[PDB]
Amino acid sequence: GPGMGASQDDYALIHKNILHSEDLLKYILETSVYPREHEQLKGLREVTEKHEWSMALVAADEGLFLSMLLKLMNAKRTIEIGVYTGYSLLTTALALPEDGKITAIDVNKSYFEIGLPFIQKAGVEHKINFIESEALPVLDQMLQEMKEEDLYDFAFVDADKPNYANYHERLVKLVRVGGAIVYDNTLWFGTVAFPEYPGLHPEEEECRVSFRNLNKLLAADPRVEISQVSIGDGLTICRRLY
Amino acid sequence: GPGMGASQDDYALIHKNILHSEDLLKYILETSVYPREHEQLKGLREVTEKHEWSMALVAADEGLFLSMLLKLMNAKRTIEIGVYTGYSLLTTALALPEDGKITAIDVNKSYFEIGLPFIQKAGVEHKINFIESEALPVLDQMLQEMKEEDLYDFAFVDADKPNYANYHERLVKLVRVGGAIVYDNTLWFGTVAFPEYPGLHPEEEECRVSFRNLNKLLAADPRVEISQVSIGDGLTICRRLY
Ligand SMILES: Nc1ncnc2c1ncn2[C@@H]1O[C@H](CSCC[C@H](N)C(=O)O)[C@@H](O)[C@H]1O
Ligand SMILES: Nc1ncnc2c1ncn2[C@@H]1O[C@H](CSCC[C@H](N)C(=O)O)[C@@H](O)[C@H]1O
Ligand SMILES: O=Cc1ccc(O)c(O)c1
Ligand SMILES: [Mg+2]
Ligand SMILES: [Mg+2]
Fold this sequence. Notes:
2 copies of one chain form a homodimer.
Chain A: H1 22-33, H2 39-48, H3 60-72, E1 77-81, H4 87-95, E2 101-106, H5 109-121, E3 128-132, H6 135-145, E4 152-157, H7 164-174, E5 175-184, H8 202-220, E6 224-229, E7 235-240
Parallel strand pairs in A: 1-2, 1-4, 2-3, 4-5
Antiparallel strand pairs in A: 5-7, 6-7
Helix pairs in contact in A: 2-5, 3-4, 6-7
């Protein structure tokens, strides 16, 4: 109710990691990520680390992996659901060719305005069409308008976790055959490995349950082939088969 | 030569994981890997788990990830360095198109013949050209005979770890521009994070130092873009730039 509002300090999982030690994750970042990170990504990350919802920021080693996937598959048209301050969005815009196009959807444009100066300085603002809205109505409107020529090569899903299965039903129609759908956070701080987990915030527990259900659904879905990858907070790559 | 024993039982790191949770790795395998694993890959994995060098076997979640990369980049011609019983090789042969081709190099064909019945039953043996040799002389012969139109789309490097830097100098000329080179085990049980790590077999220590050097070299190499991925025992994806 009324008060000071939602803080990430009310959450139990902030300080959890899936790798063996903090030293191993720090090694990966210092050795293989920061030397390869665009200066505008570094600036965007450093401001976002000070923000009240910094827990949501995509892991930087995951960012470089998404960039690699976009280049290897020659993606040109992508969709991002869940923008926050724009780290994965700027990563994507830097990876695409000059004529690449991104549809970016987030309910809160004020977060996006934090990252927008870095996107402009990087010279890739022209690739981004940002839409301030809940994603589900936008996706349903796309399904009535988009033709086969406009299908996306790649979707990154990093928004409200309990809605992922709902996003999946739209995205298997909005991404081309042979295209990729990537779901962030599918290992949810390691909590998915347990049928019950003590002391979580109600929203954290709702996400543990939803990801356990989502991971089973994706593994059984004949419309896609999958790979769940223990990078960052876990991601699942889906490739559309038909 | 004469010296100390260097069998698998002589190594210290066999059971060490890069993920901090054994339950999380089992969850990934049981939820997202085994339901998606080809029957012949399952049989090959089960035999190899009993073999005296079972620690060398590529992780099954990494297998599905490699398959996903190959499909998303539409690879058609690949090279594998380090075959063992053939798990990554069968993964690759199953992922490629019907007319895809693999050049597979290993010093020990007897290992390959353990997995060969599974590869034959999968119906993809015809894609594989197995070469029984040390890899370095083969790659140098390829540099002499390779034409630009025959460059590989994808290379998987999983053989003798101290030689990876030597392999890299040939493979950046044998893979096409825009192609991928994947180096397996670049986190080496997490020991790369530390300048010193007590209690290692001398060959394990040699690989720790070798990978610390390689990870620095790859992060600084302008010929490639990289992404180090904390799946399996760690891998590094390189994409050739010029
Ligand atoms: N229903 C909804 N539709 C669209 N965006 C939503 C949403 N519910 C939450 N979000 C947004 O999802 C985002 C999750 S954080 C996303 C992180 C970002 N991709 C990065 O690279 O760091 C938040 O910005 C939140 O505002
Ligand atoms: N110099 C060399 N040239 C080619 N192969 C070598 C080599 N030194 C060692 N090897 C081979 O490298 C292999 C490493 S284990 C390879 C694992 C396999 N790719 C999998 O999917 O499980 C062993 O089979 C070993 O015989
Ligand atoms: O909302 C919490 C949150 C936490 C971690 C994430 O990666 C994310 O996208 C969201
Ligand atoms: Mg996320
Ligand atoms: Mg290996």
